[PDB]
């Protein structure tokens, strides 16, 4: 049995590789699947994906997958809108991301898109899902008042997303009079030193849900 990954945003291929060997490919495009099926590929893991209407994995192309007798996981980002989309077809969705879109908690793309180096993969803006699990924490530790929270995080969902970040959040909240400026540094130092990284917490739980049913037979 064979597993085919598609990431590199949520978690690189670098540290995807050392957790399970698989096949990494770049976050998944339209019609990209069928090729590995044809390959003979028993599982793929759908981490990463581009959101672009023309580009985007569709919903036919799963659903194949899946009639051939391929296994389907999906988290983390487009495979977390996907597997809230197809869970009862038989793709399996696992992680926090999946869960909220599945109980209506969150809704649409808007959520996991970032902008990314398109050489390399790597995120350059922050997902809303990690910003919003990041300002609950940073709350939690007392940086921010519920008022402070809130407003920055209306602030975050109505920002274009590859100008997400948050030393760009801090700023512009700082700008705008919604957070005391040096409590905006120390808010921003938790941000970059403390993230609670979603994307990658549940990347990592898809390969761990891939790597179990590659053993199953």
Known sequence: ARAVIFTGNSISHEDAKKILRANYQPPVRRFQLEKFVQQGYKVIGIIDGIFFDRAAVGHREILSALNAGVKVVGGASMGALRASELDTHGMVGVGKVYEWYRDGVIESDDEVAVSTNPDTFEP????????????????????????????????????????????????????????????????????LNSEVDIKRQDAVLVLETVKKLIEEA
Request: a positive charge; hydrophobic letters at 35%; aromatic letters at 6%.
């Open 124 to 191: 350059i803006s922050v997902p809303l899902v990690n910003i919003r699990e990041t300002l609950k924490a940073a709350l939690d530790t007392g940086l921010v008042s519920e008022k402070e929270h809130n407003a920055l995080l209306d602030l975050a969902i109505n920002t274009y997303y590859p100008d997400r970040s948050y030393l760009g959040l801090t700023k512009e909240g700082g700008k705008k009079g919604l957070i005391p400026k040096e409590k905006g540094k120390q808010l921003l130092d938790f941000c």
